[PDB]
Amino acid sequence: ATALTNLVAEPFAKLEQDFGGSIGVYAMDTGSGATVSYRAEERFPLCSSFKGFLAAAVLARSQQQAGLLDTPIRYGKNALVPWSPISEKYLTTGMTVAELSAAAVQYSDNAAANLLLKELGGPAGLTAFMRSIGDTTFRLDRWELELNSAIPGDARDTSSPRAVTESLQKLTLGSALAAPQRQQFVDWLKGNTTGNHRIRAAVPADWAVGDKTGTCGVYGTANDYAVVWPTGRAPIVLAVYTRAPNKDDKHSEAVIAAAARLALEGLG
Ligand SMILES: *C(=O)N1C[C@H](NOS(=O)(=O)O)CC[C@H]1C#N
Numbered sequence: 001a002t003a004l005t006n007l008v009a010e011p012f013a014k015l016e017q018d019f020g021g022s023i024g025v026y027a028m029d030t031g032s033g034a035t036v037s038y039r040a041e042e043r044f045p046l047c048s049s050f051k052g053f054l055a056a057a058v059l060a061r062s063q064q065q066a067g068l069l070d071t072p073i074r075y076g077k078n079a080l081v082p083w084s085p086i087s088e089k090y091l092t093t094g095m096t097v098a099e100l101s102a103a104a105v106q107y108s109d110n111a112a113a114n115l116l117l118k119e120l121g122g123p124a125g126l127t128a129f130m131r132s133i134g135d136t137t138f139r140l141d142r143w144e145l146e147l148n149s150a151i152p153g154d155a156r157d158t159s160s161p162r163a164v165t166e167s168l169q170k171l172t173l174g175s176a177l178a179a180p181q182r183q184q185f186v187d188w189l190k191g192n193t194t195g196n197h198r199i200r201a202a203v204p205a206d207w208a209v210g211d212k213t214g215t216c217g218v219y220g221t222a223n224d225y226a227v228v229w230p231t232g233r234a235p236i237v238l239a240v241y242t243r244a245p246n247k248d249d250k251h252s253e254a255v256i257a258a259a260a261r262l263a264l265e266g267l268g
Contacts, residue, residue, distance in 0.1 A: 011262050012038040016249070019255045021220040021244025026161040027263040028169060031234030034268035035092050040162040042139075043118070044241035045150040045221050047214030049164070050126065050140050050157070051104040051113050055188055057120055057129035058101050059181040064172060069098040073115050077188040081144060084111035105212060110144040116191035117143060128192045130167060133176050137163035150216040152245055164239040172210070186202075188208055189227065197253040198224035199240065207231060214232050215251060220244025222251035229266070238263055 024039040044063040064069040071139040074094035080087065086103035086110070087095065095103070100116055103109035128181035130138040133137055140147065141156040149157075170176040172186050189210025200209050225239035240259045242251060 001037070008036055008266055009038050015258055015262070016242075016253060019173055019220070019242065019244070019252060020249055021242055023255065023259050024161040024237070025242040025259050025263050026165040027236060027238035027267055028165055029234065029236055029267045030169065030173060033266045036238075036263045036266045037162065041137075041160050043155060043158040043160055044243050045154075045158050045214075045216050045219075046138075046140065046150070047148055047150065047221060047223060048108040048110075048113075049212050049214030049223050049225060050147070051108060051187075052212035053130060053134060053138070053160065053167065053171075054116055054120070054126055055101040055105050055177050056177065057126050058097060058116055058184050059177055059185055060129060060132075061120065062097075063178055063181060071097045073119070073199055074101060075111070079115060080196070081110050081112045081114070083145075086108050087111040090198060102188055102191070106192050106194070108213065110213065114144050119222070123147075131136065133167060133170050135159075135163050135167045138167065148216040148218070150219040150221040150243065151202065152219060157261040161239040161241050164241075165237050168225055168227065168239070169237040173237065188226070195224055195226070198256045199226040199228070199238065199260040201253075201257040202264055203228050204230075217251075218247050220246075220249035222253070222256065223261060224256050224260070226260075236264065 026040040027036040040082045072094045086107050086109045100112040103112040115229040138159040147157040167221040192211050194213045195211040203209050208229040221243045229238040240256045
């Protein structure tokens with residue numbers, strides 16, 4: 001007999017009703033193949049969470065372009081947009097592609113993301129990379145900060161929790177990238193500074209976590225995806241996305257952490 005997905009799903013329904021919006025979850029146990037799924041194929045805005053996949057796309061390019069990560073990008077003052085706390089420090093020198101990638105992943109630096117998008121051929125270039133690994137759901141259409149608008153019913157700049165989780169697994173644990181690039185992606189995710197109150201909050205402190213967050217700032221729209229390495233066990237890959245119908249509906253980190261906990265506890 002197969003899983004009773006109604007019983008798996010029930011607690012997510014209760015959680016999203018108090019939240020006043022929709023919660024989307026996909027979790028994959030790479031040990032057993034067990035999954036947890038709730039609204040996992042619905043679209044949610046990516047917000048800043050696209051930046052993890054952007055760094056993966058840069059790493060893929062570096063396999064064809066030797067030394068790409070070492071390349072200085074010497075940007076002007078009009079690169080600087082709000083929530084660019086790392087790139088704003090280095091206007092007088094520029095930053096390397098590697099530094100920009102780390103900043104985009106770990107501080108969610110907006111200018112760094114825009115500069116890296118320009119290097120990859122814009123939002124279309126990132127989307128094309130995702131298509132190359134079999135992700136047909138992901139789409140990035142716009143740049144920072146317009147991509148954060150999160151308008152209900154807008155398909156631009158969205159993916160699904162399932163697609164995010166599947167692509168994350170391919171890139172961090174599968175061999176979609178060469179081993180050095182794969183480990184670099186993992187290390188950038190592990191050094192994230194913005195995720196302590198989201199999936200990380202549901203995970204025992206002695207287990208390694210790599211994640212990337214997103215917070216659109218409107219429409220109760222925020223998210224996190226992660227790889228979790230339980231000690232002596234196969235890793236877990238998961239994504240938690242939220243949205244809500246009114247522009248002034250609050251996002252909630254606690255709701256993301258709670259959904260992450262329900263997903264993690266429900267596996268296998
Ligand atoms: C991305 O969604 N961002 C970047 C900045 N940080 O938030 S995050 O949750 O760490 O990604 C502020 C919110 C928004 C923008 N712009």
